[PDB]
Amino acid sequence: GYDRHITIFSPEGRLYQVEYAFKATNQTNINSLAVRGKDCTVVISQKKVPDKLLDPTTVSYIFCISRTIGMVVNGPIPDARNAALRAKAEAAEFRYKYGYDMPCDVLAKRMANLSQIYTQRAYMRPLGVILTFVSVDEELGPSIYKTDPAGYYVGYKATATGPKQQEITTNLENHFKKSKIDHINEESWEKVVEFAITHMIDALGTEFSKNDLEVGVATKDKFFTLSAENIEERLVAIAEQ
Amino acid sequence: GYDRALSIFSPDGHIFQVEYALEAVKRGTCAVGVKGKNCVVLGCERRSTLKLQDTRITPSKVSKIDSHVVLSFSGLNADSRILIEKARVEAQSHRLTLEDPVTVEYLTRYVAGVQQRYTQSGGVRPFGVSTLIAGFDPRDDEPKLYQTEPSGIYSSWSAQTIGRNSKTVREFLEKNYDRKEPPATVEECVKLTVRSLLEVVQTGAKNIEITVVKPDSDIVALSSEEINQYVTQIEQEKQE
Amino acid sequence: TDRYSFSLTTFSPSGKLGQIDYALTAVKQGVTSLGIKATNGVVIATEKKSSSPLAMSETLSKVSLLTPDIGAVYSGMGPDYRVLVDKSRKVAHTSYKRIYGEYPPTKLLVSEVAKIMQEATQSGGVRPFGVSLLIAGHDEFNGFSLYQVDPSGSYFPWKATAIGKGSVAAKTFLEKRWNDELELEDAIHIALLTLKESVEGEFNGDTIELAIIGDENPDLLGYTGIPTDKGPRFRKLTSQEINDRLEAL
Amino acid sequence: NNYDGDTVTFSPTGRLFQVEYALEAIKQGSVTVGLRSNTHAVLVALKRNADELSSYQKKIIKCDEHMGLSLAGLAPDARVLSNYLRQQCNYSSLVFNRKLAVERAGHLLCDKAQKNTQSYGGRPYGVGLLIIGYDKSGAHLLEFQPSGNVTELYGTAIGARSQGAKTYLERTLDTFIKIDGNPDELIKAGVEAISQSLRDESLTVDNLSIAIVGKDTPFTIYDGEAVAKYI
Amino acid sequence: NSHTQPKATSTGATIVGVKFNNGVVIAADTRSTQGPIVADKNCAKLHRISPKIWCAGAGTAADTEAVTQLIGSNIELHSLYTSREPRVVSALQMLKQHLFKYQGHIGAYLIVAGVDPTGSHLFSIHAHGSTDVGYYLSLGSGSLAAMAVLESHWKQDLTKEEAIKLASDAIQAGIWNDLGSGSNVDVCVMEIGKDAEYLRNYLTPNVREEKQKSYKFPRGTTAVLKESIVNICD
Amino acid sequence: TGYDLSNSVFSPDGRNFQVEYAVKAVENGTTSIGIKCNDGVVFAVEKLITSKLLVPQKNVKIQVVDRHIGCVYSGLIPDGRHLVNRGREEAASFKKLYKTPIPIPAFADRLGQYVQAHTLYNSVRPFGVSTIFGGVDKNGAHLYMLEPSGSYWGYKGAATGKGRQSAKAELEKLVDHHPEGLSAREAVKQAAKIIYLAHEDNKEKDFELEISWCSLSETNGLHKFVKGDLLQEAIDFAQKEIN
Amino acid sequence: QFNPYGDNGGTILGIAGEDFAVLAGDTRNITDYSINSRYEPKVFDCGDNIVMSANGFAADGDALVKRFKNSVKWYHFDHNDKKLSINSAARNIQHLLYGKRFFPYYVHTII
Amino acid sequence: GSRRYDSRTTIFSPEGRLYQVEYALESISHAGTAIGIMASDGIVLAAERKVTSTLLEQDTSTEKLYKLNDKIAVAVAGLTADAEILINTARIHAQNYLKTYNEDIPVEILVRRLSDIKQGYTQHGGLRPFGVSFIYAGYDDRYGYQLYTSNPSGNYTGWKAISVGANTSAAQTLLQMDYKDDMKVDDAIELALKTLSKTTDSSALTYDRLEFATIRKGANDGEVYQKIFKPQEIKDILVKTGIT
Amino acid sequence: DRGVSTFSPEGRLFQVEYSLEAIKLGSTAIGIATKEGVVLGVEKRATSPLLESDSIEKIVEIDRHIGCAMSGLTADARSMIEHARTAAVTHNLYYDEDINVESLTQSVCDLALRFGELMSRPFGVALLIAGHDADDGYQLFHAEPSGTFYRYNAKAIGSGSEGAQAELLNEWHSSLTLKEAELLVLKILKQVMEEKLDENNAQLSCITKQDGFKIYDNEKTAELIKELKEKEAAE
Ligand SMILES: [Cl-]
């Protein structure tokens, strides 16, 4: 059964290597979440540092692709960094060639097309990662676009990824049924982060310290990640309400 | 580029791809070459399961490489065209640089070299073809007849046959051909060639092709009626 | 470095090309899409199968513009379709518009797309595309036309057809309703009826994607002044425009 | 078993079988011995023949005026590697007017052998080498293995029954290391070392092969009647 | 690379670009020259890169048409790829990098102008790959005649009708005073939020007067040696 | 199955068995460690004395990259050398274009991407080494550890090889007992001890100690080997602790 | 415009006897009207009892001698330490020189 | 490495056969039948479309019969996509010859070159062969009217009347029975249709399931005309011969 | 399947070992070296009586001072001979001298291992290279497809090689004349050959300093065959 080793069709019209690349996604056992505000887009992810000898500052699955675009990965770190480096190069080349900053959705499509090539060409394996791109686009506003090993991509009102993704998804679905809108009706990004963390706590059923989380925030003209103290400040506000 | 080594050795010291190419030659229609005192004759079989054929335009089994050399074959038909083309090009190239047409031995050596190259080149399979190359060297009246095969070996023959049931017709030639006294005339040489094919063919109608080559670029192909006369003569003498 | 320089699609003893057959099996699993040709236009339509309700289905476009007068839709693997649309748009320029100063006719663009899909059937180190396309278009000398393109690279012109999940039933439905005197509005009506059979969940302008090849649209051109330039014949129907036609259904 | 088809494949226990099978070719090869003092370095090699009508396969190759090696295993692979060393020694001279360090020579061989063990299509080298030389930091002896591993030593031996000579040198370490300013006595110690690896056969005039390099001695090879002194 | 062709058409011209309140306007004359000879008395020098981005061209006629079409083709594919309306800076960047790569051997001198989601823009591109930004710009053999008018009458906060008047007045200065320029005045207006309107032959101040005599020959004047019907059909 | 026969092939778990098999080669190799300190880093390694015939001090395993980075590895020694050769080319081209010497995090990714690239195709074999490396740059001291998969992280302390668990345990104690920090000269002494303690898992053949270090104060930010009196002082400290 | 050749002056002289041969050459090196060195040798022992000098443009002269010395070295490696005869050396040098027929060594060589 | 997944398309069997060529011929035997008949004053090409659907656009369709130049045409049997690759190559080769010699390409020369391309895919490259069999129908001033066939092996042969695709065994027997050398085009048209009508797997032979073409010298004085039949023209010729 | 350049567990290249089996199937070739010259002789082995045996060219000239005999897949030897001849003439062009027999053999043996995944497989032919030079005098080499070459005083290759080699062991001494060596090749060939030895199915050749490399006529070899039979019957 060599049709399960390389990316060619099986008798039932399936690509097993692509399917197994999806299972590699959850190998890190980390859950991520992304939501949109009025002026911003917030992405959060669990941070697990099991070894005591690790330098926790270097342990990260969130990446700053360009000034405006940020990316969080679900999957092994080697493939994650492979994708990050390429996205950074593509975003830089786009700006040089076409004279303006690469949009979040255009980058997502580009990385998805690259992923598609690995599903069709035999010598290249798929990357075992799911890439979630976030920004505040100058035309489309707050944006969330997600890519997988199949070469599939789509925009999102909000999204979640990881082992307990389905629990987080339905938690968010039920909120937007109630609010009757496509986003988090909130002025400051600080409270949009508080919303994101709160709903992850409810869905996963776990409490978080400052070192258990990792946060990325996209505003107009800049994307940035929060420090441990920035998150701690944010956790205090949730507890006091 | 496709690099795979298709022709390789086996534990018992054989190159199976070269040997399986010989099986393709054994499947092909019979071809025979007989050389006389002042001529060479190339005989060829044509299978009679194909009626409604157009013999005007159908590719002939014997091919001219130059005005003084001819090439017949047994095995895969498509493969033979590639060898013939390469040989024809080399024949013109030799005239251009040496200012003299190729010898029959040289042309054979070239064709045999090509066949060999395909037995130890990556990404290619051997030619499923064995050839009989015949003719006369420039300003020379001594008849020449050579044979090649997929492995790349070549050699000269007083008379030889290749293709299907070739072992039967080789048996015939081995007792009927005298080294001390070969066919003295054209008629004698053609008759022996037709006789040898009649051991294998079936009917002597539109199944046998004959081509006669003589010195100084004198090559001619026989028609149906001309060949039929030899068939009619041999059968009447046989009933004895 | 790619050392797969050999064919991954080969003939089996029975004469089947396994990978093409398996690609067609992938198309069978895919969501239903259809196309109908009228006297004064062509319609192509499909269901927008949403992966998640949080996902914005507007961002994912199953119906794509290839040229101003040619559109396309698919059934099968979405990513394979996307890159084919990219390659199809580019080849329309490189191998035609940059030569003749005009957009290619439907049949020839279709021919170029088929060539790309055929090469993925024979070239080294690749699998076939896991999609079947329906390409609707118009050009001056051939008028309106509708073509289907399969993983093998084969293409056939159709009066009307359907591909994917419920194609067998959908083709039977279209045989009863299709005639050579159909107006464009009648063809849109029949398309919506045909599609309702295959769709299971919600059936509205937000879950259905539908585009037409019809009259020229000067308003969608973007400029005025040149009389010969009259605008694109390809138009994607809005969510609202679909719902209007679902009331009088 | 299933993991020895090519060099690009690891076994479940983390082994490279094609590299290990290349190592096996060295064990089948004829014995050769290397040893050094502070002033000189010596190679001693037992040459092998096909039969009594044949010549004896030459084991020692010169790389420069100050460097050379002995081989054990596939001789053509030694010719490739020794040729590469000749070029590298020569590049060092033409460009930098500098004699190539014996340590760098080892590093270059290691890196050349390694590339053949990580790529598809190619194969590992099937030969072990003993490099001797005298450079700006005195005498040197190296042991090359086609896995890539190069090791600097006082003395060693490779080939069939090399364990006998290697044990002897391990005992004699303190003695032969101090043989300074005396070539013939250092060779004698090497000839006695290789003798511990002999079975049934003894060292004859066209069988033994010796080479030496040192302080005021260029790399020179002794064969034939020139080694009759040491029998 | 070939160091110029003299045979190659290289028209004299007057093209200008003027920014106004809610957009940008470009204009041009309609003379194409071959040396001292007027080849085309009504050519179109205003080109379309995209629906709302237009391009006026001077220099080597074949190079301006070829480079504007190539970038226009790639802009269309880029617009389809990104699902966005094309920007003027994208055309600008693609043009200059192409022209720079050929080191001036592609003799295209362009005024680029258009509107996009970012706003209204006006640039000029020289053959060697340098670009300039401005509120008013002029190229061509009649650029000095046009720029003289632009420097005299241009002001900040021009209306649509004032900008069209200023632009056409600048082109007229070229038409009358420059021998390389002549015939008519083409204009293209690109306003924000509206379709771009191309005004072919906006002014026609150089109409040929009635000839003094008709030169229609009596039938049979020309001596003929042979007649024959030509077959165009299959 | 057969999923473990070829590199870059996902198993039904989502695993690349060939990379995991390369880790077994690393686990088989000798022990090597890394210790981050106040203003720099310290590296140490176990060299197995196979024979009396090995020349002491003259089979150096720790390698320098540029002038400010040290690299040590466990597993297939030639694979490590190949990796360092690439590292030197990466560091050379960085300095060529950007003038400044390559930062340690920047350098870490260059190796990471190169090692990861060897898990993408079946025409190449994964690296049979875990590499501990680091140094001092503009932003201070950094220590990294890179694995066959291409995975790397920053470390306070790092260990790999046959005695990795013993070394890891001893490293964890240092991190707990010294929260404010450990000095460079102290880290050299501790490094020696941990190698000697980790030698208990490889005690058939006796061994030779080899240490190197980068420190802003002690070595002026450059990579140097520990030799002579300072080396013997560290050995004596380690000898006293085992007894 | 860049001129890749120069004239370093000097002169050389070879004479052959019955059982011996001499190759002489002055030690002065010059450019234009200046002296570069009063003692810069240009007659070299190349091994196998062959002496060589390539007078003219010194850079090309040094390059040639360097290459011939190397040719002698590889002749020993490839042919079992065989002595390179003077006639064989001469032919080898012809191929070195003609190798750069279209960008020549500006030197008069004597061995 | 990649060796593991190589099918080895260009090798011999122990019996001396090319696996992939044999399997490609097996594929072709399931394709719609195509017949070529050569007469003294013209050539007929007839071909059966593969199980037609009622909603297929018949008039603006091309599946079986293709035009290579003004004097040469081909009938296809096998994978259409593969045939079009080869057809465009053949069209280019014909134009290269015309450009070089200012003369229309001789039929055999075009056939040989197209057959040589197929041969290449069986001997080298490691790719699968083209799953296509052609019937070439053309005219030149040397040999006059000519019929050839080529198959995936790259071997080509000349014919007076020939069939390719499905039921060739049954079709060739019927052609062999009723064919004669002094035949006219109008008679050959009738033979082609009658043969298909008997060998067809369908219930009855209709206009919408056929493609038809002739190459006559029926134009005005010493010149060749290619007629690709329209649907209505097939409907009329089917009634005129008494099949429907 | 499996790689072309793969090692066996015993430490040998599979393809090289398999090519050696092909050489054992080949026709016999014998070479003997003396102080008066080197003699080369081969078994022609015609597959059929109709085949003109004089066209069987299994002994070949490389230069005037170097000859060559072959055994195994003889078609593979054509490119080896072509290379050898070019190497010989090229060396004469570069150095104005004859090329050493050993150096020529080394040049040929460098081709041997230039195969893999360069050519697709090793050569299936062994060569006996005989010649003379001023330095090492009369020499005989055996060049294998493994890239290895041994110098031999006498050597037999082919199907009857192990039987012939054992016979050469007893018969060879350092004072053999050229005439004695010629008869010794014929004698041993007649022992291992299937068919009866004569001038048509066996060929002799030699290389001497004076006359260079010469292939013997069928008339000359016939007399040596007759001289051989008479001497064996004489005791
Ligand atoms: Cl892309």
Q: Domain residue spans in chain E? A: 1-234
Nearest to E92 among A96, A99, A105 (CB): A99
Residue D171: count of CB within 10 angstroms of its CB:
11
**Mind telling me how many Å the CA of B24 is from chain C's nearest CA?**
20
Which residue of H123, H130, H136, H147 to mutate against B (max B Cβ within 10 Å)?
A: H123
Which residue of A97, A98, A153 to mutate against E (max E Cβ within 10 Å)?
A: A98
Count CA atoms closer than 13 A to I203's CA, side-chain side. Answer: 24
Residue I53 DSSP one-character state: G
Q: Are F54 and D153 in contact (CB under 8 A)?
A: yes
Structure tokens at C219: 């308003």
Residues shown for chain C: 249
**Residues facing residue C65 across a β-bridge:** C71
Structure tokens at I161: 């090689």
Rounded CA separation H234/H228 (Å): 10
Structure-determination approach:
X-ray
Residue C59 DSSP one-character state: T
Q: Are A181 and A187 in contact (CB under 8 A)?
A: no
Element (H, E) at I169: helix I161-171
Architecture of domain B1-240: 4-Layer Sandwich (3.60)
End-to-end CA distance of chain E: 43
Structural domains counted in chain H: 1
Domains for chain I: give ranges and CATH numbers.
Answer: 1-235 (3.60.20.10)
Rounded CA separation I67/I41 (Å): 11
Give the Å distance between the CA of C57 and the centre of ligand 1: 21
E-assigned strands of chain I?
Answer: 29-33, 38-43, 59-63, 66-72, 125-133, 137-143, 149-151, 154-157, 202-208, 212-215
Count CA atoms closer than 13 A to B198's CA, side-chain side. Answer: 17
Picking from F68, F31, F38, the residue whose alpha carbon sits closest to that of residue F221 is: F68
Residue I36: count of CB within 10 angstroms of its CB:
17
Q: For the domain that residue D178 is a member of, what is the CATH number? A: 3.60.20.10
**Mind telling me how many Å the CA of H26 is from chain A's nearest CA?**
21
* Resolution of the experimental structure, in angstroms: 2.9
Phi, psi of G53, deg, nearest 5 = -150, 135
Rounded CA separation B179/I56 (Å): 17
Element (H, E) at C100: helix C98-100
Q: List chain C residues with CB under 8 Å of A104.
A: none
Burial C108-139 (b: 16+ CB within 10 A, else e): ebbbbbbbbbbebbbbbbbbbbbbbbbbbbbb
- Chain D residue with minimum CA distance to G74: D86
Query: Is B6 within 8 Å of chain I by CB?
Result: yes
Rounded CA separation F124/I146 (Å): 27
Query: Is A10 within 8 Å of chain C by CB?
Result: yes
Question: C6 and B1 in contact by Cβ < 8 A?
Answer: no
Sequence-distant (≥ 6) Cβ neighbours of residue F20 within 8 angstroms: none
Picking from E86, E87, E52, E50, the residue whose alpha carbon sits closest to that of residue E69 is: E50
Phi, psi of F131, deg, nearest 5 = -115, 120
Q: For the domain that residue H148 is a member of, what is the CATH number? A: 3.60.20.10
CA dihedral I182, I186, I189, I195 (to 10 degrees): 150
**Residues facing residue F122 across a β-bridge:** none
- Chain A residue with minimum CA distance to F3: A5
Query: What Rg do the C-alpha atoms of chain A give, in angstroms?
Result: 18
Question: F123 and H4 in contact by Cβ < 8 A?
Answer: no
Whether F and D touch (3+ CB pairs < 8 Å), yes or no: yes
Rounded CA separation B198/B235 (Å): 10
Rounded CA separation B99/B79 (Å): 30
Q: Are I66 and I104 in contact (CB under 8 A)?
A: yes
Residue I72: count of CB within 10 angstroms of its CB:
26
Query: Is H155 within 8 Å of chain B by CB?
Result: yes
Q: Give the CA distances from residue H54 to residues B116, H32, H205, in Å, rounded to whole numbers and listed in that order.
A: 57, 17, 14
Rounded CA separation B189/B179 (Å): 13
Question: A2 and H2 in contact by Cβ < 8 A?
Answer: no
Look at residue C49 and give its three-state secondary structure.
coil
Q: Give the CA distances from residue F165 to residues A77, C235, F162, F200, in Å, rounded to whole numbers and listed in that order.
A: 23, 67, 8, 11
Rounded CA separation E191/B179 (Å): 102
Strand order in the sheet with A41-46: A158-161, A32-36, A41-46, A213-219, A222-225
Burial A21-30 (b: 16+ CB within 10 A, else e): bbbbbbbbeb
**Residues facing residue H84 across a β-bridge:** none
Nearest to E198 among C89, C98, C223 (CB): C223
CA F206 distance to own-chain centroid: 21
Q: Domain ranges in chain B?
A: 1-240
**Residues facing residue A98 across a β-bridge:** none
Look at residue G5 and give its three-state secondary structure.
coil
Phi, psi of E93, deg, nearest 5 = -65, -40
Q: For Cα atoms D216, D219, D220, give the angle at the middle one, nearest 5 degrees.
A: 110
Rounded CA separation C66/C116 (Å): 15
Burial B35-57 (b: 16+ CB within 10 A, else e): bbebbbbbbbbbeeeeebbbeeb
Question: In the CATH scheme, what is the homologous superfamily, with its name and number, of domain F1-243?
Answer: Aminohydrolase, N-terminal nucleophile (Ntn) domain (3.60.20.10)
Q: List chain E residues with CB under 8 Å of A96.
A: 93
Question: E52 and C226 in contact by Cβ < 8 A?
Answer: no
Burial C71-82 (b: 16+ CB within 10 A, else e): bbbbbbbbbbbb
Residue F10 DSSP one-character state: P
CA dihedral I180, I183, I189, I194 (to 10 degrees): -160
Contact residues of C toward B, CB < 8 A: 3, 5-6, 124
Rounded CA separation H72/H143 (Å): 13
Rounded CA separation B238/B194 (Å): 13
Query: Is H54 within 8 Å of chain C by CB?
Result: yes
In chain F, positions 195-234, which contact chain A (CB-CB < 8 Å)?
A: none
User: If 0-12 CB within 10 Å is exposed, 13-18 middle and 19+ buried, where does residue G43 land?
Assistant: buried
Look at residue I141 and give its three-state secondary structure.
strand
Q: Are A143 and A41 in contact (CB under 8 A)?
A: yes
Rounded CA separation F226/F188 (Å): 8
Residues shown for chain A: 241
Q: List chain A residues with CB under 8 Å of E117.
A: 138-139
User: If 0-12 CB within 10 Å is exposed, 13-18 middle and 19+ buried, where does residue A241 land?
Assistant: exposed
Q: Which chains pack against B, by 3+ Cβ pairs within 8 A?
A: C, H, I
What does the H/E/C string look like for chain E? CCCCCCCCCCCCCCEEEEEECCEEEEEEECCEEECCEEEECCCCCEEEEECCEEEEEEECHHHHHHHHHHHHHHHHHHHHHHCCCCCHHHHHHHHHHHHHHCCCCCCEEEEEEEEECCEEEEEEECCCCCEEECCEEEECCCHHHHHHHHHHHCCCCCCHHHHHHHHHHHHHHHHHHCCCCCCCEEEEEEECCCCEEEEEEEECCCCCCCCCCCCCCCCCCCCCCCCCCCCCCC
Question: A151 and C79 in contact by Cβ < 8 A?
Answer: yes
Sequence-distant (≥ 6) Cβ neighbours of residue A166 within 8 angstroms: none
Query: Is A157 within 8 Å of chain C by CB?
Result: yes
**Mind telling me how many Å the CA of F81 is from chain D's nearest CA?**
7
Q: Are C17 and H131 in contact (CB under 8 A)?
A: yes
Sequence-distant (≥ 6) Cβ neighbours of residue D45 within 8 angstroms: D30, D31, D32, D33, D59, D60, D70, D194, D208, D209, D210, D211
Rounded CA separation A46/A25 (Å): 14
In chain D, positions 67-86, which contact chain G (CB-CB < 8 Å)?
A: 86
Q: For Cα atoms G2, G6, G9, give the angle at the middle one, nearest 5 degrees.
A: 170
Question: H160 and B6 in contact by Cβ < 8 A?
Answer: no
Q: Are F38 and F181 in contact (CB under 8 A)?
A: yes
Burial D7-16 (b: 16+ CB within 10 A, else e): bbbbbeebbb
The stretches of H29-131 forming alpha helices (DSSP H) are: 80-101, 107-123
E-assigned strands of F19-139?
Answer: 32-37, 40-48, 63-65, 69-75, 129-137
Q: Are I33 and I138 in contact (CB under 8 A)?
A: yes
Residue E135: count of CB within 10 angstroms of its CB:
15
Q: Which domain holds residue H243?
A: 1-244
Rounded CA separation F145/A165 (Å): 31
CA D14 distance to own-chain centroid: 28
User: If 0-12 CB within 10 Å is exposed, 13-18 middle and 19+ buried, where does residue C19 land?
Assistant: buried
CA E191 distance to own-chain centroid: 19
Q: List chain E residues with CB under 8 Å of A103.
A: 82, 84
Question: F85 and D111 in contact by Cβ < 8 A?
Answer: yes
Domains for chain C: give ranges and CATH numbers.
Answer: 1-249 (3.60.20.10)
Rounded CA separation F85/F83 (Å): 5
Look at residue C30 and give its three-state secondary structure.
coil
Which residue of H5, H127, H128 to mutate against A (max A Cβ within 10 Å)?
A: H5
Q: Are C38 and C183 in contact (CB under 8 A)?
A: yes
Question: A58 and F2 in contact by Cβ < 8 A?
Answer: no
Sequence-distant (≥ 6) Cβ neighbours of residue A138 within 8 angstroms: A101, A103, A220, E117
Rounded CA separation H55/C157 (Å): 9
Q: For Cα atoms H61, H63, H66, give the angle at the middle one, nearest 5 degrees.
A: 95
Rounded CA separation D125/D145 (Å): 9
Q: Are H225 and H218 in contact (CB under 8 A)?
A: yes
Q: What angle do the packed helices A228-239 and A189-204 form, to 10 degrees?
A: 70
Picking from F169, F145, F130, F150, the residue whose alpha carbon sits closest to that of residue F28 is: F130
Q: Are A10 and A4 in contact (CB under 8 A)?
A: yes
Picking from F130, F23, F74, the residue whose alpha carbon sits closest to that of residue D13 is: F23
**Mind telling me how many Å the CA of C186 is from chain A's nearest CA?**
33
- Chain B residue with minimum CA distance to H127: B2
Give the Å distance between the CA of A139 and the centre of ligand 1: 21
Structure tokens at F134: 């680091």
Picking from E24, E61, E67, E19, the residue whose alpha carbon sits closest to that of residue E44 is: E61
Residue H9: count of CB within 10 angstroms of its CB:
23
Picking from A155, A8, C157, F226, the residue whose alpha carbon sits closest to that of residue H5 is: A8
Residue G3 DSSP one-character state: -
DSSP secondary structure of D95-125: HHS-PPPHHHHHHHHHHHHHHTTTBSS----
Structure tokens at A14: 């399936």
Q: Domain ranges in chain F?
A: 1-243
Which residue of C2, C6, C10, C122 to mutate against B (max B Cβ within 10 Å)?
A: C6
Query: Is H35 within 8 Å of chain B by CB?
Result: no
Rounded CA separation C109/C91 (Å): 8
Question: C225 and E188 in contact by Cβ < 8 A?
Answer: yes
The stretches of H14-73 forming alpha helices (DSSP H) are: 19-28
Select which of F1, F30, F131, F160 is catalytic: F30
**Mind telling me how many Å the CA of C83 is from chain B's nearest CA?**
26
Q: For the domain that residue A104 is a member of, what is the CATH number? A: 3.60.20.10
Question: D28 and I112 in contact by Cβ < 8 A?
Answer: no
Q: Are F37 and F70 in contact (CB under 8 A)?
A: no
Sequence-distant (≥ 6) Cβ neighbours of residue G20 within 8 angstroms: none
Structure tokens at C75: 């059934």
Element (H, E) at A10: none
F30 is catalytic: yes
Nearest to H16 among B27, B59, B78 (CB): B27
Q: List chain C residues with CB under 8 Å of B2.
A: 5-6, 124
Question: D94 and G77 in contact by Cβ < 8 A?
Answer: no
Structural domains counted in chain D: 1
Q: For Cα atoms C211, C103, C151, give the angle at the middle one, nearest 5 degrees.
A: 60
Q: Are A24 and A76 in contact (CB under 8 A)?
A: yes
Residue G101: count of CB within 10 angstroms of its CB:
7
Which residue of I18, I45, I47 to mutate against B (max B Cβ within 10 Å)?
A: I18
Q: What angle do the packed helices H80-101 and C106-122 form, to 10 degrees?
A: 110
User: If 0-12 CB within 10 Å is exposed, 13-18 middle and 19+ buried, where does residue I17 land?
Assistant: middle
Q: Give the CA distances from residue E202 to residues C94, E168, E198, F10, in Å, rounded to whole numbers and listed in that order.
A: 35, 9, 9, 68
Picking from H130, H150, H137, the residue whose alpha carbon sits closest to that of residue H78 is: H130
Fold classified for E1-234: Glutamine Phosphoribosylpyrophosphate, subunit 1, domain 1 (3.60.20)
CA dihedral H165, H166, H169, H171 (to 10 degrees): -90
